[PDB]
Design an enzyme around this catalytic site. Structure first.
Site, PDB file in Angstrom:
ATOM      1  N   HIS A  40       0.820  -1.230   0.000  1.00  0.00           N
ATOM      2  CA  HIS A  40       0.000   0.000   0.000  1.00  0.00           C
ATOM      3  C   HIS A  40       0.854   1.281   0.000  1.00  0.00           C
ATOM      4  CE1 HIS A  40       0.150   0.085   4.518  1.00  0.00           C
ATOM      5  NE2 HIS A  40       0.058   1.388   4.304  1.00  0.00           N
ATOM      6  N   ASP A  84       0.059  -7.632   1.789  1.00  0.00           N
ATOM      7  CA  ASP A  84       0.500  -6.228   1.793  1.00  0.00           C
ATOM      8  C   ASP A  84       2.016  -6.155   1.938  1.00  0.00           C
ATOM      9  OD1 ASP A  84       0.541  -3.474   1.761  1.00  0.00           O
ATOM     10  OD2 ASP A  84      -0.307  -3.223   3.769  1.00  0.00           O
ATOM     11  N   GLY A 175       1.666   6.891   8.511  1.00  0.00           N
ATOM     12  CA  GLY A 175       3.057   7.344   8.375  1.00  0.00           C
ATOM     13  C   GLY A 175       4.075   6.290   8.785  1.00  0.00           C
ATOM     14  N   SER A 177       3.397   3.144   8.090  1.00  0.00           N
ATOM     15  CA  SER A 177       3.127   2.148   7.043  1.00  0.00           C
ATOM     16  C   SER A 177       4.385   1.671   6.368  1.00  0.00           C
ATOM     17  CB  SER A 177       2.263   2.782   5.953  1.00  0.00           C
ATOM     18  OG  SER A 177       0.959   2.993   6.436  1.00  0.00           O
TER      19      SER A 177
HETATM   20  N1  LIG Z   1      -1.499   0.096  13.659  1.00  0.00           N
HETATM   21  C1  LIG Z   1      -2.438   0.950  13.204  1.00  0.00           C
HETATM   22  N2  LIG Z   1      -3.392   1.306  13.942  1.00  0.00           N
HETATM   23  C2  LIG Z   1      -2.352   1.496  11.808  1.00  0.00           C
HETATM   24  C3  LIG Z   1      -1.213   1.240  11.055  1.00  0.00           C
HETATM   25  C4  LIG Z   1      -1.097   1.728   9.757  1.00  0.00           C
HETATM   26  C5  LIG Z   1      -2.125   2.489   9.211  1.00  0.00           C
HETATM   27  C6  LIG Z   1      -1.972   2.996   7.833  1.00  0.00           C
HETATM   28  O1  LIG Z   1      -2.496   4.052   7.520  1.00  0.00           O
HETATM   29  C7  LIG Z   1      -3.274   2.751   9.955  1.00  0.00           C
HETATM   30  C8  LIG Z   1      -3.396   2.251  11.258  1.00  0.00           C
END
Ligand SMILES: N=C(N)c1ccc(C=O)cc1
Ligand SMILES: [Ca+2]
Length: 223
Positions: A40, A84, A175, A177
């Site tokens: 992503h 992913d 961020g 990600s």
């Molecule tokens: N660990 C989470 N809550 C989380 C990780 C990555 C994203 C990507 O936008 C959103 C949420």
């Protein structure tokens, strides 16, 4: 990273920042020429930034290297986020040293209860928005697949695991990600998704890297 701590400069030497004029994703250096990130995170015109602490200041240990090729997993589904994972090849080999170093791929999957280190430059707030300049870290346990599936009914595949805290307050976030989840010196996870950040009963969901080691190795072998 919400509810974490300042890692310390270059203490996470496999952590990369993906930059397209600005930081937009993390990644993990797995050898001198290749980075693992989330599918992503795919976009064109990626510059890989290694040896970063403060992503807004040149501090003296950086290596900036443009990507020559990205390979999104053949079976990545952007709707479900199944599979992913993406590989990025560097145009030139990174110079490996104590502050810029590869992270080992797992030889077996990790178990629920294993403590791991999750890191990135993502949002530090669970309600508002604040982006740090320096690398943030979180120590978090892998959660059982049953608790993961209960948290996210109908959404957890065999290529995903949950890590974090069901009580909330400590999580990865926007961020982060594509960045690493490292457990006992092995890359076991990639920051993938979650419902908000650090929300009660909504732990982070991570790409299960051990499932992809064969694909990673053979891809690298022929590219
Ligand atoms: N660990 C989470 N809550 C989380 C990780 C990555 C994203 C990507 O936008 C959103 C949420
Ligand atoms: Ca810097």
């Amino acid at each position: 990273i919400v509810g974490g701590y300042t890692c310390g400069a270059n203490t996470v030497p496999y952590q990369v920042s993906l930059n397209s004029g600005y930081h937009f994703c993390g990644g993990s250096l797995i050898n001198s020429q290749w980075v693992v990130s989330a599918a992503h995170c795919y976009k064109s015109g990626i510059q890989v930034r290694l040896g970063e602490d403060n992503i807004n200041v040149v501090e003296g240990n950086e290596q900036f290297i443009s990507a020559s090729k990205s390979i999104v997993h053949p079976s990545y589904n952007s709707n479900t986020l199944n599979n992913d994972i993406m590989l990025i090849k560097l145009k030139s080999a990174a110079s490996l040293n104590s502050r810029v170093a590869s992270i080992s791929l797992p030889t077996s999957c990790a178990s629920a209860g294993t403590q791991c280190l999750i890191s990135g430059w993502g949002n530090t707030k669970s309600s508002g928005t604040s982006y740090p300049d320096v690398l943030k870290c979180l120590k978090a346990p892998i959660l059982s697949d049953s608790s993961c599936k209960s948290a996210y009914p109908g959404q957890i595949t065999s290529n995903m695991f949950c890590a974090g805290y069901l009580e909330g307050g400590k999580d990865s976030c926007q961020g982060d990600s594509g960045g690493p989840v490292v457990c006992s010196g092995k890359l076991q996870g990639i920051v993938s998704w979650g419902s908000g950040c650090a929300q009660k009963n909504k732990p982070g969901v991570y790409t299960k890297v051990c499932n992809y080691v064969s694909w990673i190795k053979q891809t690298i072998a022929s590219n």
